[PDB]
Design a protein around this ligand. Structure first.
Ligand SMILES: O=C(O)c1ccc(Oc2ccccn2)cc1
Ligand SMILES: O=C(O)c1ccc(Oc2ccccn2)cc1
Ligand SMILES: O=C(O)c1ccc(Oc2ccccn2)cc1
Lengths: 323, 323, 323, 323, 323, 323
């Protein structure tokens, strides 16, 4: 059975392998040492023989690689080229100098080539390391995630009871504030019996507590709207989005209007009142909202969203919006 | 007479049979056992050797199928492929990894393939089982469908007297709350002499009480709007719209504005006040309302809709909106 | 003279005849008996060996035709096919399962084929019989058309004097409420010397009282707007429209703004205040009104329309709106 | 000099003559007798062997032509065909059954053919006869054109002193109320030294009083807007627009906003307050006003238009609006 | 050096000469005598053997040319044809009967041919003569340009100090009111050291007082927006526009919003409050203002424009708007 | 390592060199002497044998070049041609007489050719010289940059403490007021450990104080928006946008709404209150804000922008807006 599955998948595996293998190899060649480093949130290269690692504690560390033969334009470009092709894209010094793509295991990768870089010797690479660990919610309490709030104990209960009861909750903050990580922690409180459907650009969320679920991924020609539209034909009890980014904020808006079972998602915002604004803006970009009152969007989102958690850049909750 | 009808239809039957036969066979191969199971509302597969059946009572049951050969990728993919082709569509691992289609008897099927699913061994299938039984309205009363309401006895009369009079009534709730089932029950009260025209994505409504009627179906190239447009040229006394989903919401709006008698439909909403908002949003997506005041849509729908029943996830009426 | 007219028209007559003859024949084959029946307003078939005739008194009568060889899919399809071709259209079981067309004498016909019908044995046909008789206005009084109104005598004078003086009047109601029939009755009061131009989808209005007039018809590529635009270059004293349906409601709106000689038309509405709304909606669908205040349309229509007559489903006036 | 002008124009004259000659002949054949008739405003044919002449006094006279051979379909259709071709258009019983065109001397012609007319023996023709005479303003006073008004003497001075000063004046009424005729009369008051530019669909205005002027004409590909655009580059002192019909209404608006002196035009409206509304509607149809407040258009036109004369259907001024 | 410049330009000169030479010749043939006449502002021909010259004093003088062989359709058409081709255009009696173009030295020329003219013997030509002289501002004072104003002395100082200080000033009036001429006069007050960039359709402005400047011209495919956009990359201290006509009014609007060094321009308006309206209208026609409040444009223009000068048709300032 | 980098880049270098070498040579030929000149901000040529250098102190110096051969049309045009080609564009006397391009070292060049310039001997060239020096903020204080303000000492602290905290600050003024120069000075206050990403049309900003950073450049096909989009995927701590010009204004808006830390940019505006208006206008031009309240944009920008410095044309701060 695991036999005939291999034969059936042979042509696909071989095709996928033709890209993976060289990329895997290039990724190890350059960034092996760095990707091994523990408690890091980004690996950046700035086309000047120095690799900058952002640690979880917020400190940037540089490492000298002027000796490395792997930080040669040829070797670097090969890696770019490998990167690009893996996700069915191109990257050149003409009409495609900017690449968003991924490493073998899914980590996001931003590459920038001349003439967008200062010169033709300058290649920019940015890798976003996800949290490797799934921290339990009790750990968030113990390291004082909630300690900035007046309503600290009342909040801890809000999230636990809220989630268990199927409230619409939004975790917001800036890039690297640990929104994803926190989402993963609170899934503890969703009953084990509920059916969960996640929607992501990369695998990140884990299912330590639930047995019945399905992960959706958007990419290339498949948008997050396509995933969300699919998701609603898959009899979900919980929808976990992961990121509101663009267009889809209107679909998500219309899901709330039909009073769905318990939605959970993340967004880039600076506060509760900002969240409602980022949502209304993102939603208006969807042409299907062409005739909708922008104040009606904000008032709409205010009516439906039960709880907002905001995270400052020192990974602490500085706003716990309820109702 | 039933003779020359067969000869006339011979080419069509043969063409339809070329897809039905294999699909019928594949469906029995995989899901026969589960489709046999009584009092279920969804059959899900999560590409992990486990079949998850949602029961009427709201509990999810998993079944082990790691020994069943039918649950091999090749066999699964054949089924997927059979499914797609039956409704004149394609499903692949490139530009068509999401499918909405149907089984031989009309049950809705959602299939998702790699690279939307987490890996290339992971195939998602979701089948919505309709209610197999047509419950009499007296059964609804007895099992206390109305028992949450203050205005319980006053509502039971509102629905019976209102329907029989030709009021515009809307049943709303979440996926699986028993909207369709409830609609079918209250058709009892529409006089037996009234001509009914139904509009559906699949057969579901039944005509136990009426002799003069016609069922319409929207499919690939034919929209619900086309059906509603046709419907208003078939001298209907009652129009029954299984579901308001998208654009057609404006057409339905303009049917009400023309006075029409005895409209009856369902919708995904959380509450009465939500229903009017979901209606106004859905309507605005119709560009024929490009210049229409969104507050004028909501006030319009409020003027025209006579009754709204909302159903919570425990299959009970928690709001009976009147006038 | 009637000689050379025949020769000149020979090629056209022959071409038109190629469709008429077979359709005439098919129509007699199937519906001859029914079309003969007196005091009927619709003939429906529901693809189940039963022909349903709606009578003027509002009762649906069924007739068994399971014996008829003319209610065979082949014979039925031929008739559909004849129907379609007569009005330069197609009707199939793929991309054209819905047909709006007409019988030889103009009666509207709605045909619906699988896969919009429940199965491939099910063919839906709906024929709208016009009133065969031109009732005099005194007959409307005698059968108490106006008897529901408080202002009964004051209304009878409003319509008679109104019309004679060239007021803009609108008759509204639901399909089959006798709007057309009533229009035809009140033409009695338009002075015999006035030039009338009618605009219709089918011949229905008759000129018992006027000698100087011209009938326009919209169909296929020619819209009602084209007819109305033409109509205003034909030095009319009265414009009789017959139905406001879609786009044209704006042209009709602009005709009133130039204070025309006396307009008369019908619309599907449930009341006076509804009429103004159906008008404003229909008008906004015309792109030429893209920048027009929707409240300015309704207030515009209120300024111009002198009299609205609404007819309930028991063919009685339940609202006589003046000024 | 008149010699070499003929040789130069020889090819054009010959080409123009190929259409004129047959049309001239056909027109004389059918309508000679009626065109000879004095004090008529429309000649209509209703495809029923009767020619209906509207007289200046508002009475319709029918004439029997069932013996006239000229009123055979072949001969009628030849005339239609001649008509169409003269203005570089086609008229058929398929995609071009409506024609707007002109006779040799410019009179407007509307022709309608089957299947717009009731049957294939029915051809509609409508010819608008312009006033043949240029009545002096003193004749208008004597026959009591102003006699309905309270401010009768104060108006006669308003028109004479206002025109001579360069006010923006608008004559409005219904088709046939004598707007054109009245315009021509008041040109007496525009100083003889002023340069006048007229803009018309046909020749109608005459220059009894002015020596320095130029007439513009809009035709198939050339719009009234193009004429107005050109006009403002011909150093006009007075612009006379026979009619505001459609888009150009915005251009006329922007001429006023540039201050311009001595504008004079006509329009279809029922009253002064209607005139401002017909103007604002017509203007909004020009997409160059896509972002303009519709109440700002009406307030704009009210700020700029100095005088409005309205003419009822008994050729009398029933409103002389000032300031 | 002036040697190799000739050789380099030889091919261009020859090509330009092929059009100039014949046009120069035709222009002399027809209008030589008239173009010599001093103190004229327009030369018009009306296709009736009479040449009408508008003098500066506002009087139209006719001259008889029925004897001239140069006023022959052939000769006239040749001149039209020469005119057209000079500016890479065509002019015919079909799809190009209207021509805007220029004489050798730049004077604007409007030609109109049949069928826009009354007949095929009628050719319209309008030539706009610019002021040949650059009057000093002291001359404007002496002939009492400012004498109509209450704030006469206070105005003379406003313009002198205003301009010197770099205020945004607008000269408005009707065609031929001497807006350009007045602009040229007040350039006296712009410091000799400031860098000036002009933008025109034809050369008209002169630089008697400044040594550092550049003239831009719009024409054919190059718009005034392209010129203005260029102009802002040329390190101007003063921008002199000359005419606001259409689209560009929004660019000009955005130049003011960045608080530029001192803008000076002309517009066709009847007053200060009209100027703000013509500006807001013209600006809205620019699609880039699609979402901008029209009251926000007018209030925007009011905030930025420091001084408006309006000129009546007797070449006097009747409004000196400040602040 | 620097070895194989040369071999890898050999083809690109050679291709880039084919344009650089001639341009480098031409630039030295014409403008070498002037480019050498110290304390200049623009070098202009006005196609009249005179080179006009704008000095830092605001005085324009002319230089005679009528003897220099380099200032012949052929030589000038070669330079123009060299210029165009370097940035993959064309410049001609037909469809491309305006060029925006750059010299070898990045200085902006505007060239204008006939027929935009007054004649075919007239070539316009404008070169914007960046500040060559990176002045320390203490120099700004000493030369009294802040001395016009009431809140002088309170502002010096506002900029130093605000920057170091991550406030969103905007420097605005007119072309040449020293916005760029001032930005570079205050970068001193951004902590040395912060990762900076710059976005520019040319290199100008320098990194005297920071080790971890990456410069982005927008060019023909690559927009500033693309750079900003990329930037937000490179884990920036500070984003420095040399200039807000057009569409990207909305993207910048949505960066602020996501909370982001330490944004820093420049803009052309006259004052703080102008800045918010230029921002809201620029933003609205982005169609992604099609449905956004323009007063909501201005109120949005006011909520997010923490500090605004305005610089008058005498290189001094005349407005230090806070909160
Ligand atoms: O006859 C039926 O309806 C039926 C359905 C399902 C079924 O599934 C299971 C059960 C346990 C483990 C695995 N599969 C067995 C039998
Ligand atoms: O000479 C004319 O002007 C003339 C016009 C019309 C006319 O038409 C008639 C009259 C009656 C019956 C039939 N045709 C006869 C003569
Ligand atoms: O060495 C330099 O920097 C230099 C620059 C410019 C220059 O230009 C002049 C001066 C006067 C007349 C003409 N050209 C001469 C020398």
């Amino acid at each position: 059975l695991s036999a005939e599955d291999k034969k059936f998948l042979e042509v696909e595996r071989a095709l996928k392998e033709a890209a993976l293998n060289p990329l895997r190899h290039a990724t190890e060649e350059l960034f092996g040492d760095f990707l091994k480093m523990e408690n890091i949130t980004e690996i950046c290269y700035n086309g000047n023989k120095v690799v900058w690692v952002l640690k979880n504690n917020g400190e940037w560390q540089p490492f000298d690689v002027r000796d490395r033969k792997a930080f040669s334009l040829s070797r670097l470009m090969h890696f770019a080229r490998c990167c690009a092709s893996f996700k069915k894209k191109t990257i050149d010094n003409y009409e495609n100098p900017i690449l968003s793509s991924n490493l073998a295991n899914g980590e996001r990768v931003q590459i920038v080539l001349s003439p967008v870089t200062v010169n033709d010797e300058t290649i920019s690479i940015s890798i976003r390391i996800p949290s490797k660990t799934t921290y339990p919610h009790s750990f968030f309490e113990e390291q004082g995630f909630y300690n900035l709030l007046d309503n600290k104990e009342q909040a801890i209960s809000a999230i636990k009871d809220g989630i268990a009861i199927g409230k619409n909750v939004i975790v917001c903050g800036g890039t690297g504030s640990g929104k994803t990580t926190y989402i993963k922690s609170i899934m503890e409180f969703i009953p084990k019996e509920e059916r969960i459907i996640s929607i992501e650009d990369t695998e990140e969320i884990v299912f330590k507590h639930h047995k019945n679920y399905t992960q959706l991924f958007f990419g290339g020609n498949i948008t997050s709207a396509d995933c969300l539209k699919s998701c609603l034909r898959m009899r979900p009890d919980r929808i976990i989005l992961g990121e509101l980014r663009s267009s889809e904020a209107y679909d998500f808006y219309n899901v709330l209007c039909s009073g769905h079972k318990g939605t959970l998602t993340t967004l880039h915002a600076g506060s509760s009142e900002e969240a409602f604004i980022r949502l209304a803006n993102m939603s208006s970009s969807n042409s299907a909202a062409r005739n909708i009152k922008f104040e009606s969007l904000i008032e709409g989102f205010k009516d439906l969203i039960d709880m907002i958690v905001h995270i400052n850049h020192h990974k602490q909750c500085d706003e716990f919006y309820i109702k």
